[model samples]
Target chain A: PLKALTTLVYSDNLNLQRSAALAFAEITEKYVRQVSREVLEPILILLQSQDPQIQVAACAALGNLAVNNENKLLIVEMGGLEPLINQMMGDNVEVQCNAVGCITNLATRDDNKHKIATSGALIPLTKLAKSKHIRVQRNATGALLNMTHSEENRKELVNAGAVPVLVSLLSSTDPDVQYYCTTALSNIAVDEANRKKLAQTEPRLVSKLVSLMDSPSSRVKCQATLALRNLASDTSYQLEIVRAGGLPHLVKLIQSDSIPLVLASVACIRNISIHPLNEGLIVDAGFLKPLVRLLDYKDSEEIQCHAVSTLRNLAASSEKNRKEFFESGAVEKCKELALDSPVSVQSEISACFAILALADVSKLDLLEANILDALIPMTFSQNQEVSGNAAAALANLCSRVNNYTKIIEAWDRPNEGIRGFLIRFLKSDYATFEHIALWTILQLLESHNDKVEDLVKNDDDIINGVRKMADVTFERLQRSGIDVKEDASLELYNITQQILQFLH
Target chain B: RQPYHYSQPTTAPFQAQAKFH
Candidate 1:
């Protein structure tokens, strides 16, 4: 049918030409791969036809063809955009919809975004955004959505006053128009200038997005939720989001089983959580319970990562929230998650554990449920942050008396030895790891000197490594002009003296 | 006039176009 119809697209009979173009349009909608050079030329020529229906049908066919990335560039190279832009300004709404749709598809590519914008398609597209026809509004907003893909195009849309136009369409009776409008708003909000414009709009962008969260369509909710999340990332809009009743809706969204809603909601929660003023409100809204449950969601790593990281952020904000986190079993579940999850999630776990340890060391007893066992191996992990945080967590755990022995037992493997791993840190460039390792060793020597001496008794290199570390520090401090009598250098000299006496 | 037939192109026109850069 496509082959037969392609030839008829050039027929002298008007009906045959229209039918052929329309048929090609339908075919390309499903299988754009079938479009070829021969078919493309006819459709491009038909796009320039005098008859409105022929031009609209050809534009629809080309729009469908533009779905494929190659065809977009090909269509634009064939001068498809000029005719489409012309039809955008045409009197007929249907023709304008098709033209806008075709241009929208073409502008999806980065290179073509600049082309369409530079060709003056943005103003026409923005103008079509106000069409009374819902389809025209959808396609026009859809085109603007694609145009927002590039910074250059985003500036173009904003310069042409697309923000207010898109924001007004938020009240459209059509759900799709609302979806595209919100989606465009979200993409445009990525730019700081456009975000300011949307914020300053008369009706307020966030209020409209918050209202859309109640829409019956999940897609509308997803898009509106995503738009709110984007806006929430800007610190200035954080309070506005909560003031717009974004918390209750966002909390309800986290309860949704939909991954997109859940992910976007938590991301919004995470961003808003950054503001200390909003943290208590997020907690008071009872986001902690649902957010805790999302840790074990396991469905999406991204969702789980966001879930745990958000909890970590919440815990960091206030002592009250950290206590609530422990009461909610967030820490217990995180300990479990860290034991058997991907490396990606493990980093989040390490960070969360660091916060939990820092917030209250006694609450995370290393031996209570074998928490030290879970954290010890992570200390040697290849990812430096994971290793660093794990070491930090253990260092904090070692601050408690019982954990000192447990850390020794956990770290002092038969062949691996205690100072073996510690030796690697002797010349570490990462001062944090070096500091934490030195601190842990100092703690061990103080708390369990007998076991510490037993472990390094036969290992002269262990003593040498410690001596090397102390000598380097003393040399570094002696050479420096500022404050040689500081606590660190003094402590280093004393620690090396203490270790040398024990070794001898 | 008969409608133009969309025959397969012998060479891969889109092959070069498919790559990112």
Candidate 2:
């Protein structure tokens, strides 16, 4: 039926053209193959057809075709957006709804967003966001939501007076309208200037976003969670949110089960948890229970990424927060999760553990907890941040002499010896972490130097490793001896030479 | 990088479209 359907679309019969247009709209909504290119022909032409039914149906058909990835550019290049934007201001809500729907779908294609918005779309999209028509409000708000995805277009929308409109529509009783406006507002809040401006103009914006937590649709809640997450970028909003009682709402969201909602929930807390004062305040709101539980949520890596890193922010909070974490099993759970976390969050764990290692009391506690058992392997992680953070953490722990014995124990046996791991850091493609690894290796050698001369003399394994590493370091320095791009590499070279001098 | 805000929403397989006859 679809194959021959194009015949009626191109036929002289206007009535059948309207029917074919609506048919294309429905059929293409979910399934379309090899038809968009051929079908888009009639629909693009019919976007301006004299017949009201044909014009409106064409807008729906064109909107559905725009859903296909390739059809978006094709629709725009085939001379579609200007007429589509024209139809958005149609006298009837039917045309306006279908017209805005097509633009909404088109704007999702970022390239089309600039073209659509510049082609006279933002004002109407903003106007209809608060229009009395429900469907009009939905599509308009949805279009405005996509408009906010682009930085320049979002500023354009805000300049076109969508902020007040978006803030006002947040109260729309229509769930879809509320959600679209909510997400649009969230996306708009991504800009630093816009966030500052909204914070001042919409004085209750943070509280309003907090109230969106009560939304019926999970997407609305998820988006609102992230909206607050973005708005919390500035410390003022970060502190204001806690004072407004938003932390309790987020803890509830963290307790929610869905990946999106759960991920967004922890992320919101993760964003605001960075404030020094809020670390203890966050502890009081009961984040530990859910965040520790999320560590075991083997379902998603990102959830643990945000979950553990949120705990990372609390590292220097009142000792009470750290003590509470240790008492409630957060430290061990973080160790368990860090071992399996993706490289993305592994760096965070390393840094978090570094801060944890800074405190005299916390250092011994983490070392005894075998935190090195997790980080020692990560010290050789392929990604620099992970390995660097791990190296930095080890450096911090080894800065004190006593932690050295446990550090050696953690690197014992099949785990690969500590010397071999430090050697690996020397051969890194970049020298970013070489100095750090050197500091830790030197710390280890100084301790072993005093106590184990015989042990060093007899141990041919690490002696050979150090000689080879020394030779490699010497040549790289000699090669760039004159015009060094990184002065830090020279620091590593001089340090390597000293370690080698001591080794011989 | 941190999720400063929500990225794009997941694309639904099909979007609700307008229908008029």
Docking class of 2: incorrect
Model 1 chain A is weakest, by summed lDDT over 10 consecutive residues, at A412-421
Assign candidate 1 its CAPRI class: incorrect
Query: lDDT tens digits, residues A440-469, model 2?
Result: 666656765444334433456655655665
lDDT of 1 by residue, A1-504 (tens): 546766776677788888877776667666767456776777765776668878676777677677566887776676655765765676877877777777766666778888877866678878887868677777777777777767777888877667788888898888777777777777767766666666666457688889998899987787777777777767778888888878888888898877777877877777787677888888888888798888786668777777777787777767775555667776778778887887767888887777767654443453465666656777777877677777677677665364345555755552343354566565575555656666666666666547654665456666677777777778777787544444566666656666666555
**After aligning candidate 2 to the native by TM-score, how far in Å is the CA of A68 from where it should be?**
7.3
TM-score of every model? 0.77, 0.74
- What is the fnat score of candidate 2? 0.03
- Fnat per candidate: 0.00, 0.03
lDDT of 2 at A265: 81
